[PDB]
Amino acid sequence: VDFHGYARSGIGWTGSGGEQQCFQTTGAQSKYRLGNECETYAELKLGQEVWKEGDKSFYFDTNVAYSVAQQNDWEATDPAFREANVQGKNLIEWLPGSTIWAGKRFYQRHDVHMIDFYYWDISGPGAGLENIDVGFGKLSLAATRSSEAGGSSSFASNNIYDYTNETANDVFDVRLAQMEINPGGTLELGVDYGRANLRDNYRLVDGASKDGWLFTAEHTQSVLKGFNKFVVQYATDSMTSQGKGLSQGSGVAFDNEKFAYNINNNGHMLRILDHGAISMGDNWDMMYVGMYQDINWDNDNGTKWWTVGIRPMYKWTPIMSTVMEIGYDNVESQRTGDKNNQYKITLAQQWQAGDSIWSRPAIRVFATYAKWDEKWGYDYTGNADNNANFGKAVPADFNGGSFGRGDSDEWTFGAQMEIWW
Amino acid sequence: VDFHGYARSGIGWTGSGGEQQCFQTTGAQSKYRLGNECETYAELKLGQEVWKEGDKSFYFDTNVAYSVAQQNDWEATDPAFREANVQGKNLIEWLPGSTIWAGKRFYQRHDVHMIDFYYWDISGPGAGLENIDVGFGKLSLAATRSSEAGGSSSFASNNIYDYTNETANDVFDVRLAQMEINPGGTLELGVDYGRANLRDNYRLVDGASKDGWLFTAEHTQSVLKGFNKFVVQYATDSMTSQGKGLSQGSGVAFDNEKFAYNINNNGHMLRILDHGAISMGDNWDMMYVGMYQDINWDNDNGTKWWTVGIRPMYKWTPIMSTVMEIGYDNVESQRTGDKNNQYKITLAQQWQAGDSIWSRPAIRVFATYAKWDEKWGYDYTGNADNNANFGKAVPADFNGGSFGRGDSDEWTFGAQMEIWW
Amino acid sequence: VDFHGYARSGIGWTGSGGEQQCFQTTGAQSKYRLGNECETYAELKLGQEVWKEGDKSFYFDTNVAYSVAQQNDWEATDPAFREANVQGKNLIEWLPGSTIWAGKRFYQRHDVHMIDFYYWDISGPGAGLENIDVGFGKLSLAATRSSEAGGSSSFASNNIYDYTNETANDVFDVRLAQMEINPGGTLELGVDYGRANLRDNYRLVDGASKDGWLFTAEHTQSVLKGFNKFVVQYATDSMTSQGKGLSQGSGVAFDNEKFAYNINNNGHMLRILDHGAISMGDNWDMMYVGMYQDINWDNDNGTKWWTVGIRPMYKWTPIMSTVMEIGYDNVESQRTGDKNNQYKITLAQQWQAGDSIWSRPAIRVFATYAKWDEKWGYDYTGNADNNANFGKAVPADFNGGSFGRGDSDEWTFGAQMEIWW
């Protein structure tokens, strides 16, 4: 049996008091992780090559995930069964080297490690024909699925509270990779077409986006004994809310009191990213990110996000280093034009199983400092019924109350382990 | 560590719209599975032979099951801890080859694969002395347990709503197998005696069945490089509701509003089954079922069910085939004499790790078509309190409303993987 | 992958009727286990040495626990993710042989097997520097965490119902072990300092204990081919309620109707224990316990507990024995001076993978008999709001009602397996 997975777990303290707190900018879709993770998260994978005959094999893979608060020993939880799929390679003679798979699977996900941000992730139940040799590159075809909690009406209503039926969304993905646009550089190109798939006779709210597109172009350049990826993505309508390849075409959300509300996503998103990891000399490693994300919605409630951070690692020994992370976020409300921003600085002393900034397990002892100034927040007071500004960007002091995190500081510290195996 | 289990997972679509739907006849205790399974189900077993000295060993086995809807990637769930037992073989000198076991265990279950129907399954917490050589055959002894959600009263009441205490049921099983009644044929004989086991001073509703019997006779005949099993079972009272070897002697059920209601099972059941799998030549494999099940209750709410289906497999290659399944159901209401019936036809193109119809993993790409006509359904409208016909068979149009699935059609299609390892 | 764990599972019956019942004295913090365990409990550990270079290694360990009632086969549950940690040995040159760990971990827990009582257990999320060679012994340093369900107020209130915020408690542990005070005898010394760690601006109820100490001294003496441990512990205030090394400094509890109530623990605890396991000859093994525990609270609601039991094992064969357990409990109410007492006697026939009383797997077939006489119980009638004596020791017949288990008997019997691997 092959045993694989991912896990992080630790203990932490907040400078001003209590358990460790973590810091993410309001409106930002991520935070800089080092010394800024507040849960024990673990994926336990048990797979196995179950049959092989020459070139041909069938591989079976599973994945059970756990997320607990790490405030006690006995912490009961609901594990998520995330993967259960079978991959058959070289089963099709006419398309050599290609794999046919079916089942629940984490499919070719692209992410930026230091911000734990996935930018191209259509995982879920699915099926596909993978790595077909097109000569100049490899072509992959996949269909995966997701579903919104409500959004469909059994009959025609004008009342949004009637659209409570779960709505399936399908994604049809096509990728063409490993094309050497240049020396030390490859180009991947993807097209995602997602759409809400209604049961016979159901209906979506009038004006719901229904479908959309995600277009991706990723260029990888081998550099400084590392790499640099430069990404450009553009989404349309139903693909703009999740923004990673999954569709949300009903445009309906629910308050905690089960009230439906209209979160319509007609609009577009433009993401331009550049991240990588480079070694410089023998004593230095560094990962870096720079991103600009603009979600422009018809309804005016989008955001324009900018991030940058770097994570230099200095190796004292082949197994001991000092890692440092500095991250900066700035998010502007499409609705109000206000701006939330933050900068985090973490300093850690670590021990890792390797000499790379990618080496795991790592055991860290850190101190983090964050200072923010948020001038807007989302209005989640009231009910989708009470509140009519429910879920909308609103200034920090709107109507005497207060939104966003304010303008303060905080420092935390602790020890943590992270590992993938 | 030995890693074993079962898992199926896929993606599907309904002809008329939305996620894949599955089709089972109202009153039928099963459906024909091919291209008719709508969940990701998986059992992950980790066991190990923990001690061995010569002929003697102790084996430890566990089983954790997961069932998710397969509509999203992150699907939190409550796994079922189904097995945790220790089997000690050859530990008793005077009864060589026999095993003593204790713990939660899937014990010698008999099922019909294509309809995923278990007809002899007394699994659960238990203990036993297994495979004792009686000379002409092997004798097995086991005691297992189950419990109904309510059914017991702490005191005497005339009000069914008072019988809300969980009621333990015990099964005492004796089997005598591997007797060669003939050439290429064996005979197994079993006797199950189940009974509700009340706490000191509790009582069951007046007239509750309390106990019952299940008698099984299974004949296996080696044929056409395969087998054919012919089964005949007869149950009495408390064993008729579950109908697989477990007892439900309280005769009390609960509506979703926590209302107790009387589901009394005094009566009997007669099951006559014949299934098998035969290879015919080199290019053909086929499994088949034919069953007649009559649950005749004193309360008149039983059913008389008839099924038949076949699943021919034609091998193009040793790893690629075309499988087809055709199934037919017909259930008649004991209470109303009406009839529900259905026929399903599925066509699949598969790739399996082997040349058998029993070879797994299998990766299928299918299309299913079902056409039904249901003339009765169960009344689950109202409350066990509001409704007094609650849970009873009622005609399709009863009192202007509508019961059963109607008279329609539907086709689905998709890809799926199934595997046992 | 290393597969390890613990599991017990069985089937049982109560003499007077129904599923097996188990017997523990009111006020006692444990029961004598043999033939007195009523659940299927299992810990499945999957770990692995992930990197090794010479003397240095990184080990990764996990632990997922399950507890089900064992009354049915399908029993859905919420597993507890109890361990996910990484241990790095010999990573620090100046402190050879020492381990640095971080993550959730069962840390050096001390327990008495026959009563399944842990007396020194600070496990949970944590981090530490383990086994530092101090020359005359090994020094260990650890910081772990726990948190109470409520206990903190966002603002100052005089109303206990306002203290509903979860309150983190930190433990700082220092141990010095393996000192040979004598021949065949070692001495371990520990100091635990626990404290409630409030968020900036939160407050604890007026008079809440806040912090406390646990002092441990354990002497192990190699004897009769076995050992004998003699323990003496003394706790103060916040460490007296849990009494194993974890802190509960808020002093606030909640009724099932979510009502806060004051369970203040200022006071002290004195525990004096002696347990061991000795072999006597070739045909006899025996474990034994004797303990006196005095929890003296300022609020007068403590207890003075005395236990003693022995578990002789007589080996007929190297794999078959007859085990017997006799246990006695006596608990006196600090508040009322009344006394609850019980004696249990179990007789079992077992088969184990080994000739020791510590050999597992063990498959038992037993009969247990318990006879008790309880003259007090805790008042949990009403609400923390209705009842003002809620949670207090009260005589058996207090105000006409009845508290405690009474004065009766009962016998049970069944089969069970227990195993650690």
Ligand SMILES: OC[C@H]1O[C@H](O[C@H]2[C@H](O)[C@@H](O)[C@H](O)O[C@@H]2CO)[C@H](O)[C@@H](O)[C@@H]1O
């Ligand atoms: O497995 C390789 C990747 O491991 C991590 O990815 C984790 C991520 O950190 C965690 O927060 C997420 O929930 O699960 C994935 C594992 O599936 C790193 O973050 C990635 O950079 C690595 O490539």
Ligand SMILES: OC[C@H]1O[C@H](O[C@H]2[C@H](O)[C@@H](O)[C@H](O)O[C@@H]2CO)[C@H](O)[C@@H](O)[C@@H]1O
């Ligand atoms: O998918 C990778 C991410 O997995 C986790 O995130 C979970 C989260 O823990 C869960 O509560 C939420 O409902 O779903 C997400 C996955 O969609 C990890 O926490 C992250 O580190 C990973 O990025």
Ligand SMILES: OC[C@H]1O[C@H](O[C@H]2[C@H](O)[C@@H](O)[C@H](O)O[C@@H]2CO)[C@H](O)[C@@H](O)[C@@H]1O
């Ligand atoms: O493990 C051998 C059997 O595998 C399957 O049995 C599954 C069944 O398909 C699934 O629906 C049920 O819930 O669990 C069992 C595994 O315990 C096949 O259906 C059987 O025909 C095989 O003999």
Ligand SMILES: OC[C@H]1O[C@H](O[C@H]2[C@H](O)[C@@H](O)[C@H](O)O[C@@H]2CO)[C@H](O)[C@@H](O)[C@@H]1O
């Ligand atoms: O026991 C074999 C069957 O196991 C599963 O069925 C579960 C079902 O998933 C669960 O929701 C229900 O409560 O219990 C049954 C088992 O009693 C599989 O779904 C089936 O394929 C198997 O036949």
Ligand SMILES: OC[C@H]1O[C@H](O[C@H]2[C@H](O)[C@@H](O)[C@H](O)O[C@@H]2CO)[C@H](O)[C@@H](O)[C@@H]1O
């Ligand atoms: O693993 C060695 C110890 O196994 C058991 O400890 C169990 C205990 O029995 C169980 O009730 C508890 O919940 O979990 C632990 C396993 O972590 C024995 O009780 C101990 O005496 C053994 O040393």
Ligand SMILES: OC[C@H]1O[C@H](O[C@H]2[C@H](O)[C@@H](O)[C@H](O)O[C@@H]2CO)[C@H](O)[C@@H](O)[C@@H]1O
């Ligand atoms: O920690 C060892 C003990 O683990 C279990 O006890 C659990 C119990 O099952 C769970 O319901 C409760 O909430 O937490 C405790 C652990 O704190 C075993 O049941 C025991 O045998 C062990 O002593």
Ligand SMILES: [Mg+2]
């Ligand atoms: Mg749950």
